[PDB]
Structure 1
């Protein structure tokens, strides 16, 4: 029965990210006074499947100046880390219940950064090298900020688990107690997912394609699947942590529905941000994080250290 559970977690997530590509194209089009795809499917619903079939029936085109081992390892690594990151999320009962779920999330995200770096260095090209170095800078900045944000929020919570987050947000959201942490966490999830404004790793204008400039179809599709799965996951993690869905012990279906609605809203918010804003410079992203978010989040981490002590509202261990 457990393999059936794995299938019912994995297959809907892959269909969800393919239709996330469709929804992104249509939302960007309708914000650009045009349409999305509406010819391939009845309403464009077959467009991601056509794109996937075309990408998997084009040749992968191994290059000459290329470390082949890392060149092959990196996209498979990215996809398996995206799915492994999807594993421990509770809706409201996780497939795999981890005590240190947030720590697992952080470790898997850093390993995904390593997948991007190894692809960029293995594809022995200058634009790939540029994309890899930009990824290094970006992950430095958002890694330190994300660690502080999660520390303060889970200090407001009890343990490092996520069912504890459900029980914490049973009565009220965490957005109202810590909304500045929610804003900085939203920006940090954008930086983690390498999304607009500060994508900077697949920068189509500064670079040609960044770290994917030598990846032809196939493993390029694997990288795209990993990126969009990470988009849905970061929005899902944001709505589990901050915008707590309604939980009732008798029925969890309304919890799943509320989680779905809020995750869809935050994914559409990501596409909205991409339509709205231009790109940062990757030194400006580092300056912005290390000069605005890091001092403010250090102060707010200190405030959330002091808050349960002076309010006597220390959360329980379990």
Structure 2
């Protein structure tokens, strides 16, 4: 029945990808004195169905100067990635308990840059070429802060096994030991994230990033007998983070590129190095090095 478990994950995540959009528009709506989708079905419950089947009935126009092969495989990778990093999440018990789950999460999430890079190239337009160039450099700039934060975070965890994160936190949320890193981590997650697909690809990244941040910094207690306790806690924590993720979507003017690079390489990277230096010696400092096994 293991295959059934995959569909018991991919589809609801796909629906979860579908259904937080109404949350977004109504949160973004009610924020600006507005109402959000509330006329199509009760409180816009059927609004996601109101757009999806319309989109699939819309003809997918293709640019004349577009390489079809790349134009159709770039979304293939984009969706394939966006629904793959959901598999090793230590949600109650992960589908895959890869001993190197954190590395697998990073390598495969850093692969998303290919989709946007190919989309700009395959589209073959002046707008698409720069937009791909801007998006990728913004993205490829920000794994170095991503990797260091996660690396330095995991010194006090014990290994890259994502299931071990629960044991590490247990007593207190792990933010209380690395809250300078949490703001370091959370901000970096904002910027790293056919056309019908591209909704799904980046969007699962939005929730999973917050799901990834949820387990990493704000853990829960996984009772061996009853697993529903971790389920509710995990969902509630990743909902609060995502609401915050859209809380800041309509609360700041968007970053400009020169500051976007300046913010990292001159005010985020050097501080990330110091915290990593702080969190590499502190387990040694207090003889609190964790067990890998």
TM-score bin, normalised by smaller chain? over 0.9
Contact 1:138 1:191 in 2 (8 A): yes
In the alignment, is residue 226 of structure 1 matched against residue 205 of structure 2? no
TM-score, reference length from structure 2: 0.98
Aligned to 2:175: 175
**Displacement, 1:296?**
0.7
Contact 2:116 2:136 in 1 (8 A): no
Of residues 234, 239, 247, the one that matches 1:259 is: 234
In the alignment, is residue 311 of structure 1 matched against residue 286 of structure 2? yes
Aligned to 1:35: 35
The number of residue pairs the alignment matches comes to 293
Q: Distance in 1 between matches of 2:221 and 2:51?
A: 37
Aligned to 2:224: 249
Q: Distance in 1 between matches of 2:88 and 2:9?
A: 11
**Displacement, 1:96?**
1.1
SS at the partner of 1:290? helix
Instruction: Structure 2 unaligned segments of length 5 or more: list them.
Output: none
**Displacement, 1:136?**
2.1
SS at the partner of 2:175? coil
Q: Distance in 1 between matches of 2:17 and 2:92?
A: 21
TM-score, reference length from structure 1: 0.90
SS at the partner of 1:86? coil
Q: Distance in 2 between matches of 1:221 and 1:61?
A: 12
- Structure number with the bigger relative contact order (C-alpha 8 A, sep ≥ 6) is 1
Aligned to 2:124: 124
Aligned to 2:270: 295
Instruction: Structure 1 unaligned segments of length 5 or more: list them.
Output: 194-218
Alpha-carbon RMSD across the aligned residues, in angstroms, is 0.9
Q: Distance in 1 between matches of 2:276 and 2:207?
A: 27
Q: Distance in 2 between matches of 1:288 and 1:47?
A: 38
Q: Distance in 2 between matches of 1:18 and 1:311?
A: 47
Q: Distance in 2 between matches of 1:310 and 1:37?
A: 54
**Displacement, 1:146?**
0.5
Q: Distance in 2 between matches of 1:24 and 1:187?
A: 19
Contact 1:146 1:188 in 2 (8 A): yes
In the alignment, is residue 98 of structure 1 matched against residue 73 of structure 2? no
Q: Distance in 2 between matches of 1:10 and 1:41?
A: 25
Contact 2:182 2:217 in 1 (8 A): yes
Structure 1 runs, 4 residues or longer, greater than 6 Å off: none
Q: Deviations over 1:18-60 (max 9, x none)?
A: 1111100000000111111111121101111111111111111
**Displacement, 1:275?**
1.2
Contact 1:92 1:166 in 2 (8 A): no
Aligned to 1:209: none
Aligned to 1:215: none
